[PDB]
Amino acid sequence: MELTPDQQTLLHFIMDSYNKQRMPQEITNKILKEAFSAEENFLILTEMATNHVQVLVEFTKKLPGFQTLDHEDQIALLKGSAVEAMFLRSAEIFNKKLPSGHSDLLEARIRNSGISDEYITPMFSFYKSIGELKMTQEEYALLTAIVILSPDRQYIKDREAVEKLQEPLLDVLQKLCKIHQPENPQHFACLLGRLTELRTFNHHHAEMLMSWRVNDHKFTPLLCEIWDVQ
Amino acid sequence: DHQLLRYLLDK
Ligand SMILES: CCOC(=O)[C@H]1CN(C(=O)c2ccc(F)c(F)c2)CC(C)(C)c2c1[nH]c1ccccc21
């Protein structure tokens, strides 16, 4: 029912690693500052994503038992989760309460940043759906760790070794859902269900990036490696 | 090869 000393220790350690990310305000203040062109926005978002991947690798390395895993599986786990983790983080940032009309202005700037409407509509639908769950920072952090440590990922040699690392994190999250939301016994199921929804953003990701209304699609070498672009 | 990702993982 309640968190054991080891579970409390695990949660606090995951939270410290997760808090090393760029602050939601640091991302929202840049966008909400001035009205930027599609060429400027693509450059702003490319830098944001490069930083996201950089901090994600550091967070991933800190996950208990990740260093003990086979080198090939480590790469496949990061490459297979990077996009999902970026959309989970983007959802956390968008749903952060801001002053009156600020979240609506942020939505407007992203919708008019150069991206095709075909990819925007399911993206803001997912952000608004995630928001409805009223997730805490601990749930966002644990859900990110669960996403990264998904054994049912492509090209993984030893699934069982990944299962053993994900299992305590699922147990911690399950306990937290029963604590923060005892009114809704389906809350944990909703979170896990949102992981399947996250997987849909993978297949057409490179397509969304190349269909951006910019003459030239420049990416950093790290993004090219993680997103399989250029 | 994912040499940049492998480097960031080793260090
Ligand atoms: C945490 C790191 O997030 C990113 O870097 C995103 C963020 N994305 C957001 O919608 C977003 C951004 C800022 C907010 F404050 C917010 F609430 C949401 C999604 C997307 C538009 C699809 C994108 C990102 N980087 C790109 C690079 C090239 C092309 C497209 C993107």
Side-chain angles (χ1 to χ4, degrees), chain A residues 27-28 31 42 45-46 48-49 52 86-87 89-90 93-94 106 110 115 123-124 127 208-209 212 219 227:
Chain A
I27 281 138
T28 55
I31 312 157
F42 191 79
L45 293 168
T46 285
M48 274 186 194
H52 178 266
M86 190 198 72
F87 284 103
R89 182 63 183 177
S90 301
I93 304 165
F94 182 69
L106 179 75
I110 297 159
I115 178 163
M123 207 182 287
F124 277 109
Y127 299 167
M208 172 275 290
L209 304 163
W212 204 275
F219 302 98
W227 290 346

mmCIF file of all heavy atoms in Angstrom, chain A residues 27-28 31 42 45-46 48-49 52 86-87 89-90 93-94 106 110 115 123-124 127 208-209 212 219 227, ligand 1:
data_model
loop_
_atom_site.group_PDB
_atom_site.id
_atom_site.type_symbol
_atom_site.label_atom_id
_atom_site.label_comp_id
_atom_site.label_asym_id
_atom_site.label_seq_id
_atom_site.Cartn_x
_atom_site.Cartn_y
_atom_site.Cartn_z
ATOM 1 N N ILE A 27 11.596 27.121 -21.535
ATOM 2 C CA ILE A 27 11.085 26.756 -22.856
ATOM 3 C C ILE A 27 9.888 27.660 -23.252
ATOM 4 O O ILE A 27 9.883 28.195 -24.361
ATOM 5 C CB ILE A 27 10.786 25.226 -22.917
ATOM 6 C CG1 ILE A 27 12.088 24.432 -23.112
ATOM 7 C CG2 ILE A 27 9.750 24.860 -23.995
ATOM 8 C CD1 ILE A 27 12.186 23.217 -22.289
ATOM 9 N N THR A 28 8.902 27.839 -22.348
ATOM 10 C CA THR A 28 7.712 28.662 -22.607
ATOM 11 C C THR A 28 8.015 30.157 -22.760
ATOM 12 O O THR A 28 7.374 30.801 -23.590
ATOM 13 C CB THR A 28 6.598 28.427 -21.579
ATOM 14 O OG1 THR A 28 7.094 28.623 -20.257
ATOM 15 C CG2 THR A 28 5.956 27.061 -21.711
ATOM 16 N N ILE A 31 9.249 31.066 -26.470
ATOM 17 C CA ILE A 31 8.142 31.017 -27.429
ATOM 18 C C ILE A 31 7.160 32.182 -27.221
ATOM 19 O O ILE A 31 6.836 32.876 -28.186
ATOM 20 C CB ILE A 31 7.440 29.625 -27.409
ATOM 21 C CG1 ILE A 31 8.470 28.472 -27.488
ATOM 22 C CG2 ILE A 31 6.394 29.509 -28.533
ATOM 23 C CD1 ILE A 31 7.982 27.160 -26.950
ATOM 24 N N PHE A 42 11.849 26.594 -36.231
ATOM 25 C CA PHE A 42 12.480 25.299 -36.511
ATOM 26 C C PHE A 42 13.861 25.218 -35.854
ATOM 27 O O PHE A 42 14.236 24.156 -35.367
ATOM 28 C CB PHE A 42 12.580 25.032 -38.025
ATOM 29 C CG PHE A 42 12.965 23.615 -38.380
ATOM 30 C CD1 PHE A 42 12.026 22.591 -38.337
ATOM 31 C CD2 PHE A 42 14.259 23.308 -38.777
ATOM 32 C CE1 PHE A 42 12.379 21.281 -38.668
ATOM 33 C CE2 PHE A 42 14.612 21.997 -39.112
ATOM 34 C CZ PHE A 42 13.668 20.995 -39.061
ATOM 35 N N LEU A 45 13.202 25.029 -31.955
ATOM 36 C CA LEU A 45 12.728 23.683 -31.631
ATOM 37 C C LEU A 45 13.818 22.606 -31.813
ATOM 38 O O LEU A 45 13.858 21.664 -31.016
ATOM 39 C CB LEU A 45 11.432 23.345 -32.402
ATOM 40 C CG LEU A 45 10.162 24.154 -32.037
ATOM 41 C CD1 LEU A 45 9.065 23.942 -33.057
ATOM 42 C CD2 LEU A 45 9.633 23.808 -30.654
ATOM 43 N N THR A 46 14.708 22.757 -32.832
ATOM 44 C CA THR A 46 15.849 21.859 -33.087
ATOM 45 C C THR A 46 16.830 21.895 -31.893
ATOM 46 O O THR A 46 17.282 20.837 -31.458
ATOM 47 C CB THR A 46 16.492 22.156 -34.459
ATOM 48 O OG1 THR A 46 15.629 21.639 -35.476
ATOM 49 C CG2 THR A 46 17.880 21.533 -34.630
ATOM 50 N N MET A 48 16.021 22.938 -28.761
ATOM 51 C CA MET A 48 15.224 22.422 -27.640
ATOM 52 C C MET A 48 15.304 20.898 -27.622
ATOM 53 O O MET A 48 15.612 20.324 -26.586
ATOM 54 C CB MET A 48 13.751 22.827 -27.773
ATOM 55 C CG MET A 48 13.431 24.157 -27.206
ATOM 56 S SD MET A 48 11.634 24.447 -27.258
ATOM 57 C CE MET A 48 11.617 26.182 -26.949
ATOM 58 N N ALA A 49 15.062 20.257 -28.779
ATOM 59 C CA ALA A 49 15.112 18.802 -28.929
ATOM 60 C C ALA A 49 16.500 18.214 -28.727
ATOM 61 O O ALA A 49 16.597 17.140 -28.143
ATOM 62 C CB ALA A 49 14.557 18.390 -30.269
ATOM 63 N N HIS A 52 17.042 18.268 -25.104
ATOM 64 C CA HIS A 52 16.192 17.220 -24.530
ATOM 65 C C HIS A 52 16.867 15.854 -24.610
ATOM 66 O O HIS A 52 16.940 15.164 -23.595
ATOM 67 C CB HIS A 52 14.791 17.166 -25.161
ATOM 68 C CG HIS A 52 13.978 16.052 -24.578
ATOM 69 N ND1 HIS A 52 13.931 14.807 -25.180
ATOM 70 C CD2 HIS A 52 13.332 15.985 -23.388
ATOM 71 C CE1 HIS A 52 13.239 14.039 -24.357
ATOM 72 N NE2 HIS A 52 12.839 14.711 -23.278
ATOM 73 N N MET A 86 10.231 12.773 -25.474
ATOM 74 C CA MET A 86 10.126 14.185 -25.858
ATOM 75 C C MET A 86 8.666 14.649 -25.852
ATOM 76 O O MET A 86 8.403 15.748 -25.381
ATOM 77 C CB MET A 86 10.793 14.462 -27.213
ATOM 78 C CG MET A 86 10.914 15.947 -27.532
ATOM 79 S SD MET A 86 11.205 16.341 -29.275
ATOM 80 C CE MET A 86 9.592 15.954 -29.979
ATOM 81 N N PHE A 87 7.726 13.814 -26.351
ATOM 82 C CA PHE A 87 6.293 14.128 -26.361
ATOM 83 C C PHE A 87 5.686 14.082 -24.968
ATOM 84 O O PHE A 87 4.792 14.873 -24.672
ATOM 85 C CB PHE A 87 5.516 13.257 -27.363
ATOM 86 C CG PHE A 87 5.736 13.733 -28.785
ATOM 87 C CD1 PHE A 87 6.593 13.052 -29.642
ATOM 88 C CD2 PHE A 87 5.096 14.879 -29.264
ATOM 89 C CE1 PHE A 87 6.800 13.504 -30.962
ATOM 90 C CE2 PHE A 87 5.308 15.334 -30.577
ATOM 91 C CZ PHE A 87 6.155 14.642 -31.418
ATOM 92 N N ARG A 89 7.431 14.870 -22.201
ATOM 93 C CA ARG A 89 7.966 16.112 -21.620
ATOM 94 C C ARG A 89 7.232 17.348 -22.166
ATOM 95 O O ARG A 89 6.881 18.234 -21.390
ATOM 96 C CB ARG A 89 9.488 16.233 -21.827
ATOM 97 C CG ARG A 89 10.128 17.493 -21.211
ATOM 98 C CD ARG A 89 10.025 17.573 -19.695
ATOM 99 N NE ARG A 89 10.586 18.828 -19.190
ATOM 100 C CZ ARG A 89 10.581 19.205 -17.917
ATOM 101 N NH1 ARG A 89 10.040 18.428 -16.990
ATOM 102 N NH2 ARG A 89 11.116 20.365 -17.559
ATOM 103 N N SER A 90 6.981 17.388 -23.489
ATOM 104 C CA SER A 90 6.248 18.481 -24.143
ATOM 105 C C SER A 90 4.847 18.623 -23.566
ATOM 106 O O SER A 90 4.367 19.741 -23.411
ATOM 107 C CB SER A 90 6.166 18.244 -25.642
ATOM 108 O OG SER A 90 7.471 18.166 -26.184
ATOM 109 N N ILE A 93 5.149 20.298 -20.087
ATOM 110 C CA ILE A 93 5.379 21.736 -20.267
ATOM 111 C C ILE A 93 4.085 22.472 -20.653
ATOM 112 O O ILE A 93 3.742 23.460 -20.005
ATOM 113 C CB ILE A 93 6.554 22.030 -21.246
ATOM 114 C CG1 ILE A 93 7.860 21.337 -20.788
ATOM 115 C CG2 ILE A 93 6.777 23.538 -21.400
ATOM 116 C CD1 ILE A 93 8.972 21.270 -21.851
ATOM 117 N N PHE A 94 3.362 21.987 -21.678
ATOM 118 C CA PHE A 94 2.119 22.617 -22.132
ATOM 119 C C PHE A 94 1.042 22.707 -21.045
ATOM 120 O O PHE A 94 0.353 23.723 -20.954
ATOM 121 C CB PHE A 94 1.568 21.934 -23.398
ATOM 122 C CG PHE A 94 0.304 22.567 -23.940
ATOM 123 C CD1 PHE A 94 0.329 23.834 -24.514
ATOM 124 C CD2 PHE A 94 -0.917 21.904 -23.856
ATOM 125 C CE1 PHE A 94 -0.847 24.428 -24.992
ATOM 126 C CE2 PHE A 94 -2.087 22.489 -24.353
ATOM 127 C CZ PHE A 94 -2.044 23.747 -24.914
ATOM 128 N N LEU A 106 0.568 30.037 -26.285
ATOM 129 C CA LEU A 106 1.619 29.046 -26.526
ATOM 130 C C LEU A 106 1.146 28.040 -27.586
ATOM 131 O O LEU A 106 1.904 27.720 -28.501
ATOM 132 C CB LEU A 106 2.020 28.330 -25.224
ATOM 133 C CG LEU A 106 3.112 27.240 -25.328
ATOM 134 C CD1 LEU A 106 4.494 27.845 -25.496
ATOM 135 C CD2 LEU A 106 3.083 26.332 -24.121
ATOM 136 N N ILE A 110 2.813 27.475 -31.514
ATOM 137 C CA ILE A 110 3.237 26.131 -31.937
ATOM 138 C C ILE A 110 2.468 25.723 -33.204
ATOM 139 O O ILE A 110 3.080 25.218 -34.142
ATOM 140 C CB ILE A 110 3.122 25.083 -30.784
ATOM 141 C CG1 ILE A 110 4.075 25.439 -29.608
ATOM 142 C CG2 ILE A 110 3.400 23.652 -31.290
ATOM 143 C CD1 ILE A 110 3.714 24.817 -28.252
ATOM 144 N N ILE A 115 4.816 23.735 -38.852
ATOM 145 C CA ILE A 115 4.350 22.343 -38.847
ATOM 146 C C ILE A 115 2.997 22.174 -39.565
ATOM 147 O O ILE A 115 2.148 23.070 -39.507
ATOM 148 C CB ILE A 115 4.344 21.811 -37.381
ATOM 149 C CG1 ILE A 115 3.815 20.350 -37.272
ATOM 150 C CG2 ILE A 115 3.622 22.769 -36.411
ATOM 151 C CD1 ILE A 115 4.138 19.630 -35.968
ATOM 152 N N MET A 123 -1.372 15.835 -31.693
ATOM 153 C CA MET A 123 -0.364 16.273 -30.729
ATOM 154 C C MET A 123 -1.005 17.070 -29.586
ATOM 155 O O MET A 123 -0.792 16.725 -28.422
ATOM 156 C CB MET A 123 0.697 17.109 -31.448
ATOM 157 C CG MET A 123 2.042 17.097 -30.800
ATOM 158 S SD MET A 123 3.152 18.162 -31.739
ATOM 159 C CE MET A 123 3.417 17.137 -33.211
ATOM 160 N N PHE A 124 -1.805 18.118 -29.914
ATOM 161 C CA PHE A 124 -2.497 18.929 -28.907
ATOM 162 C C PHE A 124 -3.658 18.175 -28.275
ATOM 163 O O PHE A 124 -4.041 18.498 -27.151
ATOM 164 C CB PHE A 124 -2.911 20.315 -29.426
ATOM 165 C CG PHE A 124 -1.781 21.317 -29.356
ATOM 166 C CD1 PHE A 124 -1.154 21.759 -30.510
ATOM 167 C CD2 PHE A 124 -1.339 21.812 -28.131
ATOM 168 C CE1 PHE A 124 -0.091 22.664 -30.445
ATOM 169 C CE2 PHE A 124 -0.272 22.714 -28.068
ATOM 170 C CZ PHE A 124 0.338 23.138 -29.225
ATOM 171 N N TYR A 127 -1.784 16.166 -25.617
ATOM 172 C CA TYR A 127 -1.388 17.084 -24.537
ATOM 173 C C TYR A 127 -2.578 17.416 -23.645
ATOM 174 O O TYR A 127 -2.437 17.407 -22.426
ATOM 175 C CB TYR A 127 -0.753 18.389 -25.073
ATOM 176 C CG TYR A 127 0.520 18.255 -25.888
ATOM 177 C CD1 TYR A 127 1.008 19.325 -26.631
ATOM 178 C CD2 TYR A 127 1.260 17.071 -25.884
ATOM 179 C CE1 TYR A 127 2.178 19.215 -27.377
ATOM 180 C CE2 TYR A 127 2.428 16.948 -26.631
ATOM 181 C CZ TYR A 127 2.888 18.026 -27.368
ATOM 182 O OH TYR A 127 4.035 17.918 -28.109
ATOM 183 N N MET A 208 6.919 14.311 -40.253
ATOM 184 C CA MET A 208 6.476 15.574 -39.661
ATOM 185 C C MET A 208 7.608 16.617 -39.770
ATOM 186 O O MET A 208 7.352 17.765 -40.151
ATOM 187 C CB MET A 208 6.030 15.332 -38.201
ATOM 188 C CG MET A 208 5.728 16.598 -37.404
ATOM 189 S SD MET A 208 7.181 17.378 -36.638
ATOM 190 C CE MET A 208 7.550 16.195 -35.379
ATOM 191 N N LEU A 209 8.854 16.196 -39.447
ATOM 192 C CA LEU A 209 10.054 17.028 -39.514
ATOM 193 C C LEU A 209 10.364 17.512 -40.934
ATOM 194 O O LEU A 209 10.686 18.684 -41.099
ATOM 195 C CB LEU A 209 11.277 16.281 -38.955
ATOM 196 C CG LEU A 209 11.185 15.729 -37.529
ATOM 197 C CD1 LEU A 209 12.254 14.689 -37.296
ATOM 198 C CD2 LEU A 209 11.246 16.835 -36.492
ATOM 199 N N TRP A 212 7.876 20.175 -42.694
ATOM 200 C CA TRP A 212 7.928 21.496 -42.061
ATOM 201 C C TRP A 212 8.073 22.548 -43.151
ATOM 202 O O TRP A 212 8.890 22.379 -44.064
ATOM 203 C CB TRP A 212 9.126 21.583 -41.097
ATOM 204 C CG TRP A 212 8.953 22.613 -40.018
ATOM 205 C CD1 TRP A 212 9.234 23.945 -40.099
ATOM 206 C CD2 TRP A 212 8.437 22.389 -38.701
ATOM 207 N NE1 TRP A 212 8.919 24.568 -38.913
ATOM 208 C CE2 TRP A 212 8.439 23.633 -38.033
ATOM 209 C CE3 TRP A 212 7.972 21.254 -38.018
ATOM 210 C CZ2 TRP A 212 7.998 23.774 -36.710
ATOM 211 C CZ3 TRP A 212 7.548 21.391 -36.705
ATOM 212 C CH2 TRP A 212 7.546 22.642 -36.070
ATOM 213 N N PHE A 219 19.351 19.889 -39.131
ATOM 214 C CA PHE A 219 19.315 19.230 -37.823
ATOM 215 C C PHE A 219 20.736 19.081 -37.291
ATOM 216 O O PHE A 219 21.691 19.064 -38.070
ATOM 217 C CB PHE A 219 18.677 17.835 -37.917
ATOM 218 C CG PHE A 219 17.275 17.774 -38.466
ATOM 219 C CD1 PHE A 219 17.046 17.452 -39.798
ATOM 220 C CD2 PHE A 219 16.176 17.968 -37.634
ATOM 221 C CE1 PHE A 219 15.742 17.366 -40.299
ATOM 222 C CE2 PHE A 219 14.874 17.878 -38.136
ATOM 223 C CZ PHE A 219 14.667 17.586 -39.465
ATOM 224 N N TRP A 227 16.881 10.440 -34.384
ATOM 225 C CA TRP A 227 15.655 10.505 -35.190
ATOM 226 C C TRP A 227 15.746 9.831 -36.570
ATOM 227 O O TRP A 227 14.724 9.731 -37.252
ATOM 228 C CB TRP A 227 15.197 11.968 -35.353
ATOM 229 C CG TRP A 227 14.676 12.626 -34.107
ATOM 230 C CD1 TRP A 227 14.324 12.018 -32.938
ATOM 231 C CD2 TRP A 227 14.355 14.013 -33.950
ATOM 232 N NE1 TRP A 227 13.849 12.947 -32.048
ATOM 233 C CE2 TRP A 227 13.835 14.177 -32.649
ATOM 234 C CE3 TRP A 227 14.459 15.139 -34.784
ATOM 235 C CZ2 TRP A 227 13.401 15.420 -32.167
ATOM 236 C CZ3 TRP A 227 14.036 16.367 -34.307
ATOM 237 C CH2 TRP A 227 13.500 16.498 -33.020
HETATM 238 C C1 LIG C 1 10.966 19.139 -24.518
HETATM 239 C C2 LIG C 1 11.569 19.244 -25.857
HETATM 240 O O1 LIG C 1 10.428 19.421 -26.877
HETATM 241 C C3 LIG C 1 10.766 19.751 -28.142
HETATM 242 O O2 LIG C 1 11.890 20.033 -28.476
HETATM 243 C C4 LIG C 1 9.580 19.726 -29.057
HETATM 244 C C5 LIG C 1 8.419 20.162 -28.504
HETATM 245 N N1 LIG C 1 7.110 20.078 -29.056
HETATM 246 C C6 LIG C 1 6.020 20.900 -28.606
HETATM 247 O O3 LIG C 1 4.926 20.774 -29.126
HETATM 248 C C7 LIG C 1 6.181 21.912 -27.528
HETATM 249 C C8 LIG C 1 7.255 22.807 -27.520
HETATM 250 C C9 LIG C 1 7.382 23.749 -26.513
HETATM 251 C C10 LIG C 1 6.427 23.794 -25.524
HETATM 252 F F1 LIG C 1 6.530 24.708 -24.533
HETATM 253 C C11 LIG C 1 5.366 22.922 -25.527
HETATM 254 F F2 LIG C 1 4.448 22.996 -24.539
HETATM 255 C C12 LIG C 1 5.221 21.979 -26.515
HETATM 256 C C13 LIG C 1 6.846 19.106 -30.140
HETATM 257 C C14 LIG C 1 7.311 19.546 -31.545
HETATM 258 C C15 LIG C 1 6.614 20.840 -31.991
HETATM 259 C C16 LIG C 1 6.836 18.424 -32.477
HETATM 260 C C17 LIG C 1 8.878 19.711 -31.644
HETATM 261 C C18 LIG C 1 9.854 19.783 -30.493
HETATM 262 N N2 LIG C 1 11.148 19.925 -31.050
HETATM 263 C C19 LIG C 1 11.073 19.947 -32.444
HETATM 264 C C20 LIG C 1 12.114 20.073 -33.372
HETATM 265 C C21 LIG C 1 11.816 20.075 -34.729
HETATM 266 C C22 LIG C 1 10.505 19.955 -35.164
HETATM 267 C C23 LIG C 1 9.464 19.828 -34.246
HETATM 268 C C24 LIG C 1 9.733 19.824 -32.880
#
